[PDB]
Structure 1
Amino acid sequence: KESAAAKFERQHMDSGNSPSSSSNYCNLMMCCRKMTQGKCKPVNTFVHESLADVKAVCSQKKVTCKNGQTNCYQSKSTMRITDCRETGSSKYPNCAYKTTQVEKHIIVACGGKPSVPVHFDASV
């Protein structure tokens, strides 16, 4: 059972000067989106585009994935994305990320039917 003391810490404690700071975006999203359980996912990109625009990439430019698979596609246009990358100081269970906002082309692997994005490969 989660002790009452530990529950209180989880539900009400967030010690710090700038808790609502945008440089915290990745720390909170990586946690919310469940990518900090068991280990700290080292790198992860968030796309701030319409889901309609991201799905459209699956019928755009064909390219080879980094792992040799052949079901990857590159966006014809650049997309507003946020790069979340683990800091040198990050150490599980205290995962820390650097938030970087950029506009780059994305590369995703598409699968299933209808064909939709199932993996983020890279940004170029």
Structure 2
Amino acid sequence: MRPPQFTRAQWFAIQHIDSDSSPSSSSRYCTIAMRAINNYRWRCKPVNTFVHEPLVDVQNVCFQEKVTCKNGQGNCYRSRFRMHITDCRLTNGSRYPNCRYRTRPGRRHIIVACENRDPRDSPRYPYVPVHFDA
């Protein structure tokens, strides 16, 4: 479950946005970057994608191409441009708290579900991404 102390938009950013990414080209990037996520979980997260772009550019996807969400509801949006991403996949020997990941950089269009900010989210960003849809 999402940790209740974080809004939907906050938890999306924690798990999926890394705008300060100079060690992402390292093979250890995922093992390092997943720690902060797994600290709020009871088992190593098996798979996780980070988007390596400035926050504003990820948020701006919410104003790009509207596409149907996998669940058929809400509002999802596909980035006009491909974005830098890193896919992180848990290794088979991993067992919490020792979570080791394979790091797989790439570039893809991202699809995000977006919605109005929570009251606890900054009012500077009225409409924000809350999930990946692909």
Q: One fold, TM greater than 0.5?
A: yes
Provide the aligned C-alpha RMSD in A.
1.8
Contact 1:61–1:73, Cα closer than 8 Å, also in 2:
yes
Contact 1:108–1:117, Cα closer than 8 Å, also in 2:
yes
- 1:54 maps to which residue? 58
Deviation at 1:112, TM superposition (A): 1.4
Residue 91 in structure 1 maps to residue 95 in structure 2: yes
Deviation at 1:97, TM superposition (A): 1.0
Identity %: 61
2:28 alignment partner, SS class: helix
- 1:40 maps to which residue? 44
Q: Give the whole-Å Cα distance in 1 for the aligned partners of 2:92 and 2:73.
A: 31
Contact 2:64–2:80, Cα closer than 8 Å, also in 1:
yes
2:60 alignment partner, SS class: helix
Farther-moved stretch of structure 1 (97-106 vs 112-121): 112-121
Gaps of 5+ in 1: 1-20
Q: Give the whole-Å Cα distance in 1 for the aligned partners of 2:50 and 2:112.
A: 12
Amino acid at match of 1:53: D
1:1-124, aligned counterparts within 5 Å? 22-31=26-35, 33-36=36-39, 37-113=41-117, 114-122=126-134
- 2:10 maps to which residue? none
Deviation at 1:25, TM superposition (A): 0.8
* Moved beyond 3 Å, runs of 4+: none
Q: Number of matched residues?
A: 101
Deviation at 1:35, TM superposition (A): 2.7
What is the CA deviation profile of residues 25-66 of structure 1, one whole-angstrom value per residue up to 9, with x for unaligned ones? Answer: 1011000x3235311111111111111111110011112222
Higher RCO (C-alpha 8 Å, min separation 6)? 2
What is the CA deviation profile of residues 83-115 of structure 1, one whole-angstrom value per residue up to 9, with x for unaligned ones? Answer: 111122222232121101101001111111411
* Bigger Cα Rg: 1
